[PDB]
Structure 1
């Protein structure tokens, strides 16, 4: 059953390319920020009055 797709090796190439351009679409799609937001939510309601 893997050998069935050894018998279509170009099929496995195609799977690899689907990975290449799904992943290329991802890296040209995914946003960038170094710290995937960790801290708990903290609303800081503040005020000011002289």
Structure 2
């Protein structure tokens, strides 16, 4: 339960800074793109019997 932190608004403000500092740094190392790995993977065998 809260109530703690009301007597301690610095310790509470501190959490809210770290959580914000953590991610954000994350935003500058997290891979970007449209979709993640979505489609089932496939393997293809290629043969050739000329003629």
Fold shared per TM-score above 0.5: yes
More helix by share: 1
Unaligned runs of 5+ residues in structure 2 are none
Aligned residues: 50
Higher Rg: 2
Q: TM-score, normalised by structure 2?
A: 0.75
Unaligned runs of 5+ residues in structure 1 are none
Superposition RMSD on alpha carbons, in Å? 1.6
